[PDB]
Amino acid sequence: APTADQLVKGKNPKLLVLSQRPIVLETPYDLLVSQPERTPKEILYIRNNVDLPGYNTVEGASLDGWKVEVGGLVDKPFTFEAKELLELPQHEVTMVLQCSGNGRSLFQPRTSGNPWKRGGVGNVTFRGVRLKDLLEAKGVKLGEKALYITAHASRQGNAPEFVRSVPIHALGHALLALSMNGEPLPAVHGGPIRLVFPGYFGVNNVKWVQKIEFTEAENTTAEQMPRYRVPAIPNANIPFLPQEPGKTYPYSFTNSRPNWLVAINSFIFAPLEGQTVEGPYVRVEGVAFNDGIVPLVSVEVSANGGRTWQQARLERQEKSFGWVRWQATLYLRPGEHEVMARAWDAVGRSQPLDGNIAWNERGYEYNGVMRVKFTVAH
Amino acid sequence: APTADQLVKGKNPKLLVLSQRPIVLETPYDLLVSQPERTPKEILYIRNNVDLPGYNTVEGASLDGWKVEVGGLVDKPFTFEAKELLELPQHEVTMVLQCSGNGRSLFQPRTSGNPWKRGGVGNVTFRGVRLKDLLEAKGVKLGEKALYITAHASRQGNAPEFVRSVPIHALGHALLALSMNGEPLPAVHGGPIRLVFPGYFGVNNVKWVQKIEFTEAENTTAEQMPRYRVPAIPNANIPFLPQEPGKTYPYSFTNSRPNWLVAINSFIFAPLEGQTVEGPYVRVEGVAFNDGIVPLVSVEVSANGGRTWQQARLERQEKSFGWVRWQATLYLRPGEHEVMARAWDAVGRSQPLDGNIAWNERGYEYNGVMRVKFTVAH
Ligand code: MSS
Ligand code: MSS
Ligand SMILES: [Cl-]
Ligand SMILES: [Cl-]
């Protein structure tokens, strides 16, 4: 019966243990909602596909000796020591770090993989050096065929490979993170250095980064294809191509797309499922987010199954990779009620009313409208 | 001052003349709304990029002698005469036929191209033989590398080429149309044979089809790249990548996507702009559509600038390539009012509140929330 504190030094003992090898921990929802500004390292979810031996602590790690290779389609490949980043211009970013498998357990029938509820997400601040700023300092130029950034994790400890490719558009905000929430990046969260892509699913934010290559194509590792993909019509304007629930799909590069941009979403933080609340005026609160490319336009709530939707008040109006808090105050008579929340962004993206339309066999990118049932009292 | 009836035999004289060579005609909105079930050939918009000499009539054309080549990545290329289709299984489809430039004039600043309002759309029924059913009858199998259908218009009359590529997924519903709205396909609408792709923008539905090739890549004609594209992150889940309005974009195959799937939309048919209507109860009516891959979930209307949204009643609930009629009845006090409509489909797609976020220099795929201002009387 090993608890989270025993698997990972400094983790809150209440974290749900989804897997021991590799280490997978989920934040209980009540704990997640207690930190609506920023998710602390004590409770932040963990998902290792590949464990790095000795990295199972929230303590920072040493930069000493850590070398990163940069190459591929650049005019002048080079190697740098992580410590050299301390002298370069630094940037900070608050972003939603969300597992592509977050919400997996809401798909029916059951899919393959760690059975997340909604606790495979956090809102965190990374600080470090932008990849573009490093290239600039080193006097390096990208080739015309550089269409992807392909990042490889350390193989120290005889670890298996972990290699992800994201579109070259990600170079705009790509960050070599040395710090998280103002402290040394925790070892277990990729310290001493992690390549982060704001507004991309967690899988892409490569912990313990050792090599960065600019490539003309997606890498052909198993972690790029067939895993961490959903059925799609490539380069057509549909979020995914729906499939029969429960059926195996023959994933290829040409019939599916990677888990890249964080799917637009909204979580209801109050009230909680099954809670009793009082009076007629019921303040519904939560957070909402997208991939940070454009602002949210609205978060809307309905207590009548979608017959009418009421605009919530959002605490910030600018675009952001971090979540945005919202509230909507509703007049409700005593009794059982159900509230749902829906986000809507400036380019028209929103959430499916029934998230199960997105059923896929490894259970990625769930973003169905969240519903909460509770009781209103006198 | 040549009117539409003089440019194209059998067209309603009230059609707006956007261009004489090539021929471009737009349906006035009042006429469009008068036909909420099916748009007749007398009023249906015309957009030729490339005129076919002598095809400027709503009359049907002869199938005699019309040969179509089918080849590329198929095991057994072949040629067929259009008349052979008369003996094969036939299918009909009602679909929104919409110019990718429809709505172009709502972009600010002005973009390049024919200045459509909203009359570059119709709802029509095509009948003919499915491309897949033809391949089956001929005992032909697609190669494993067939990722696109590339269709070429007739060059008769020494006409310039017109070549479009759509994803092989389109093979599911691709139709060799011989009839429109129950009559011989009008010459000016591509008679005697047009390759139609339900739920794809009009540009893709190749009139006077003479060659169909299954190809591994998009064709490299000017009509495929750089035209009929919008900025994008290829194979990422965002409908388009927003750009600064008024700025020229360096279109390539790797930074933009074609005008393929019809963008989700909703049009308000009643009331009309500037109209006075009576009593407190105001019935708002219109149509809505997507690319037909999934059903619409709702059409919603707001008369308070989006503070509250009310679900309309849709006349049909199943998915469709054709538009779906809706109505929402609102209680409104006397005075000036503004109503807006928003569609929402099962995969979460919706419309941008401000359609100008999609500004692109050739003015494609406008689908901003439609607003109508009118007066309520006592
Ligand atoms: N190196 C590395 N990195 C990496 C990995 C591994 O395994 N390795 N994983 C992923 C995932 S998958 Mo699904 O999309 S989520 C996720 C993330 C997590 O984070 P944290 O653990 O820190 O929270 O990470 C990311 N990155
Ligand atoms: N062959 C051909 N086809 C074709 C063409 C040309 O020019 N040619 N155009 C386009 C377009 S461009 Mo924009 O996306 S719209 C459109 C359409 C139209 O139809 P109608 O004329 O029938 O209505 O067609 C289509 N197809
Ligand atoms: Cl997982
Ligand atoms: Cl046009």
A341 with A193, same domain? no
Q: Is residue A221 part of a domain?
A: no
Q: Is residue B222 part of a domain?
A: no
B74 with B185, same domain? yes
Domain count, chain A: 2
Q: How far is A232 from chain B (nearest CA, A)?
A: 8
Last residue of one domain, picked from the residues A215, A241, A275: A215
DSSP assignments along B311-377, one per residue = EPEES--S--SS-EEEEEEEE--SEEEEEEEEEEETTSBB--SSGGGG--TT-------EEEEEEE-
Q: For residues B354 and B365, is the Cβ–Cβ distance under 8 A?
A: no
A124 with A272, same domain? no
Is the CB of residue B202 below 6 angstroms from any atom belonging to ligand 2?
yes
Find the closest chain B residue to A310 by CA distance: B308
Q: Is residue A203 part of a domain?
A: yes
> Which residue is listed with tokens 């025993």?
A6
Find the closest chain B residue to A298 by CA distance: B306
Q: Biggest alpha carbon distance in chain A?
A: 71
Q: Of B141, B347, B8, B71, whose CA–CA distance to A353 is shortest?
A: B347
Q: Which domain holds residue B340?
A: 265-376
Q: Is the dihedral of CA A338, A344, A348, A349 positive or negative?
A: negative
Last residue of one domain, picked from the residues A177, A193, A215: A215
Q: Count Cβ atoms within 10 A of the Cβ of residue B21 and give its class: 0-12 exposed, 13-18 middle, 19 or more buried.
A: exposed
Q: Is residue A222 part of a domain?
A: no
CA of A17 to the centre of ligand 3 (A): 12
Q: Is residue A19 part of a domain?
A: yes
Query: Given in angstroms, what resolution was this structure solved at?
Result: 1.9
Q: What is the 3-state secondary structure (H, E, C) of chain A?
A: CCCHHHHCECCCCCCEEEECCCCEEECCHHHHHCCCCCCCCCCCCEECCCCCCCCCECCCCCCCCCEEEEEECECCCEEEEHHHHHHCCCEEEEEEEECCCCCHHHCCCCCCCCCCCCCCEEEEEEEEEEHHHHHHHHCCCECCCCCEEEEEECCHHHCCCCEEEEEHHHHHCCEEEEEECCEECCHHHCCCCEEECCCECHHHCEECEEEEEEECCCCCCCCCCCCCEEECCCCCCCCCCCCCCCCCCCCCCCCEEECCECCCEEEEEECCCCCEECCCEEEEEEEEECCCCCCEEEEEEECCCCCEEEECEECCCCCCCCCEEEEEEEECCCEEEEEEEEEEECCCEECCCCHHHHCCCCCCCCCCCEEEEEEECC
Q: Is residue B242 part of a domain?
A: no
- Reading the block at residue A333, the tokens are 């008579």
Q: Is the dihedral of CA B209, B123, B35, B338 positive or negative?
A: negative
- Reading the block at residue A290, the tokens are 């997208």
How big is chain A by its Cα radius of gyration, in Å?
A: 21
B284 with B202, same domain? no
Distances (CA, A) of B201 to A110, B100, B347: 37, 6, 19
A164 with A48, same domain? yes
Q: How far is A177 from chain B (nearest CA, A)?
A: 24
CB atoms within 10 A of CB A248: 8
CB atoms within 10 A of CB A231: 18
What is the C-alpha to C-alpha distance for residues A184 and A58, in angstroms, rounded to an integer? 9
Q: For residues A28 and A14, is the Cβ–Cβ distance under 8 A?
A: yes
A50 with A175, same domain? yes
Q: Is residue B233 part of a domain?
A: no
B193 with B272, same domain? no
Q: For residues B5 and B92, is the Cβ–Cβ distance under 8 A?
A: no
Last residue of one domain, picked from the residues A195, A215, A235: A215
Residue B203 φ/ψ, nearest 5 degrees: -55, -35
A329 with A191, same domain? no
A82 with A160, same domain? yes
Q: Which residues of B touch A329 (CB under 8 A)?
A: none
Q: What is the dihedral of CA A15, A16, A19, A21, to 10 degrees?
A: 10
A130 with A17, same domain? yes
B300 with B165, same domain? no
Here the CATH number for the domain that contains residue B47 is 3.90.420.10
- Window 265-304 of A, Cβ < 8 Å to B: 291, 293-294, 297-298, 300
Here the CATH number for the domain that contains residue A363 is 2.60.40.650
Q: Is residue A232 part of a domain?
A: no
B198 with B75, same domain? yes
Q: B126 Cβ partners below 8 Å, 6+ apart?
A: B92, B93, B95, B175, B177, B179, B180, B185, B194, B196
